[PDB]
Paper text:
Here we report a functional and structural genomics effort that applied saturation-level transposon mutagenesis and next generation sequencing (Tn-seq) to identify essential genes in B. thailandensis, followed by high-throughput structure determination.
By using an ortholog rescue strategy for insoluble or difficult to crystallize targets, we increased our structural coverage of B. thailandensis essential genes from 31/406 (7.6%) to 49/406 (12.1%). Ortholog structures may also be useful in designing broad-spectrum antibiotics with cross-species activity, and by representing a variety of functionally conservative point mutations in the active site may be useful in developing drugs less susceptible to mutations that cause drug resistance.
Residue numbers in the entry:
A (entry chain A): 3 to 422
B (entry chain B): 0 to 422
The structure:
Amino acid sequence: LRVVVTGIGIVSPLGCGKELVWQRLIGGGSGLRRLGDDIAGELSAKVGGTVQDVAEDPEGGFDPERSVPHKELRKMDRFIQMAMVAADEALAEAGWAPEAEQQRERTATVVASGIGGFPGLAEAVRIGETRGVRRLSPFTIPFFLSNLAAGQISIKHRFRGPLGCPVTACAASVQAIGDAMRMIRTGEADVVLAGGAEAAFDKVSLGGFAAARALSTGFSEEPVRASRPFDRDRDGFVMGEGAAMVVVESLDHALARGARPIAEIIGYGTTADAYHMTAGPDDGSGAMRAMKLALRMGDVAPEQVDYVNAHATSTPVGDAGEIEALKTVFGVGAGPAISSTKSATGHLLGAAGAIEAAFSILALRDGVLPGTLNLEHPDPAADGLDLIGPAARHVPVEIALSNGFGFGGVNASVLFRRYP
Amino acid sequence: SMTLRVVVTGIGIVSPLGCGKELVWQRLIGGGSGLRRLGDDIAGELSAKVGGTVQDVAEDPEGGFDPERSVPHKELRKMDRFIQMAMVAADEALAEAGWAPEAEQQRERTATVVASGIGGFPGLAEAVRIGETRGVRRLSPFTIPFFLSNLAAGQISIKHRFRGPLGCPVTACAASVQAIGDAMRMIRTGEADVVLAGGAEAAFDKVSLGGFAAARALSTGFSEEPVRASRPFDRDRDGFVMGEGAAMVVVESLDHALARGARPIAEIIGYGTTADAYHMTAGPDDGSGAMRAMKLALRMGDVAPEQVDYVNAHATSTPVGDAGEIEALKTVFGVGAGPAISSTKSATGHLLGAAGAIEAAFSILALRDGVLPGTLNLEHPDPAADGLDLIGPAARHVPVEIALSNGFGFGGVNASVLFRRYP
Ligand SMILES: C=C1C[C@@]23C=CC(=O)[C@@](C)(CCC(=O)Nc4c(O)ccc(C(=O)O)c4O)[C@@H]2C[C@@H]1CC3
Ligand SMILES: C=C1C[C@@]23C=CC(=O)[C@@](C)(CCC(=O)Nc4c(O)ccc(C(=O)O)c4O)[C@@H]2C[C@@H]1CC3
């Protein structure tokens, strides 16, 4: 059964609204900024991809009151608020707003997060250390539970089909899209609102990644330079926040209702390294297998892939592993054009898969491949791979692959074809 | 292939009634309870004083929890308690199944799908307290993977070299019902041959308990008589009793099991999942989303309601929750006949994200042995349940062929899984 995407929503460090975000991305913009001392004061990691408010970004700022009434915001952590805005955008684009119970019952909501409501949870613990646990809000638990992103979206829109919340670290929202497609094919839903949401900035979460030496520290005075996937001087990832959503349905379902497919989902693959808890193997074998499964599903040879949106987070070991995986799948000398948009957005963690899927889809729609900012001295291990430098590449393309990996050895890859 | 019959070939349990499914089963069927007074470090400030706790080998010599049996002592520092329980339950299930592939051909066809509701809450809470006292610069390098929900499946995969899909559904108290449904789905789509599926939860902390107490969801009226506090369907229920544990099943096609000589313990014939889109912490009074999930599982199994012998209800002992499920059961099954219904949360407490997997295991064992667990504490059944065959405290010894198990959660999540006895 053929499956398509009919709507996209984005809340990100480059703004809210996918057209504006796309225009900013291709123009070389960056969402990386110095973090507040309340988050980063104790740490050497001083830079993050932050979502700005309307006062800071009048055109593209985040105002969750447009999707959630003021008095309801108290009931949901930031990631959920972001999820609600991104979902509204994707649904409006897809024109999916079912009033009838039949259609509502056939709409699923599958929204990933990596860490979920960390700020809410941290605040509850801090209350426990101060005012006392007898003073916790009645909303404490659903405020931070990961599945209340999907939950609040479903309540608002009356989506009464399956609910999902994959929490598979930084691959989670790639899996959300694969899980959406799988449900369309098994007949368990007719439309899926799928994606990811993450808003985990807090001294403790940042501190936890810091303690693992996973975060960039050497570019604090030049924040836009800090995220440099594939570059010789990369020194760890830059945490980001945001949310991105896609509306997924069968091609036949889309065309019957007059919805324009934006792109087709033709492949999905997911695997486990079973290697180490926080690093993948140097040979990239788990990631390699995930990519090959998505290509097999799409019946696409490696030489037919035009564009790869790599997971590459700007870690030394992580980017090297993905380089090796890509060489195994595609060879050297020819192959796909490859970039990492984490160079501009930072690492949206459990929302990274969905935002990069969205960029992969827009790349196909527009024949514009995002560049990799800061790619000044490519890792020599990547010689023979067509890594896109800072300039976006304007070229008609048909097939795009997007990767997402996470702690716990999770690899996921999703493959798209241009429509028509 | 979508027409594959799917079976369970091994089961593992870590619970408030012990570790090891056979011992746990014998203790459950004998009317045992895992409910105990919590430590003051957890519940000292709160009026919810009772929990289903997992005991160590000093406290329970035959059935105690010793994670060093599964994980070297040095490595325990790297994993929160929910993961340690997951590891022990997974080892049990895998040993019973005889699934320990050494070749990549089989390793690549083994998935690992382990739910949690809250994940490493004690780990996360400790990191935050460290942050307030000693400073975030003192955090362990293992802080993040210590608590991430998916590191339960992750650590299991690493130990056993399972290289197929990893899953971690975090859909609250329906989560490990969905894990089983997701496992079945993956066998039917051809994405895996064997799935280690289940749930793991160890969320006891003053803040998590405090949060549930703030939602008025916890029992507070039975502190002096802990074993009486979890009373699903009873007139005097006043909220659920939090528990901890892990349970796992090994899922594969019947054809694959027969090929390798593994004995199916039961068959998985149906799964359904729905969303209420009603309220963030309560379902509708008529249980209509639960009803729909149950009917979807029955439809998938091609089973009429009158063919169901046993229902392991979600019923957690909350006033509104159990009443909703009563109404859903009446809609699906009618009144006057219908299945025998019990809730084993009466004995184990609510294992949250691991409730689905443990209750699945009990439903499977019920079919295997022809013994339906009772509902402890059911002294004055809610009148709304008149017409439903609620099992009282005594386990019922009767041959049975079909069992349904429900799991629901905050955010309007409903899931149901349906089993048939094997052969
Ligand atoms: C075992 C080691 C060696 C060490 C050395 C160099 C590194 O690059 C890091 C810092 C990160 C590895 C990595 O990219 N993991 C890694 C991964 O497997 C999957 C995903 C991500 C992600 O960001 O999405 C990720 O970050 C590792 C982690 C830990 C300590 C230092
Ligand atoms: C909206 C209300 C009314 C209120 C009144 C009586 C109740 O019984 C509770 C306390 C819990 C309802 C419930 O069982 N939710 C509920 C649910 O939907 C799904 C799962 C569970 C679970 O334990 O697994 C659950 O607990 C609710 C919660 C909140 C405040 C008081």
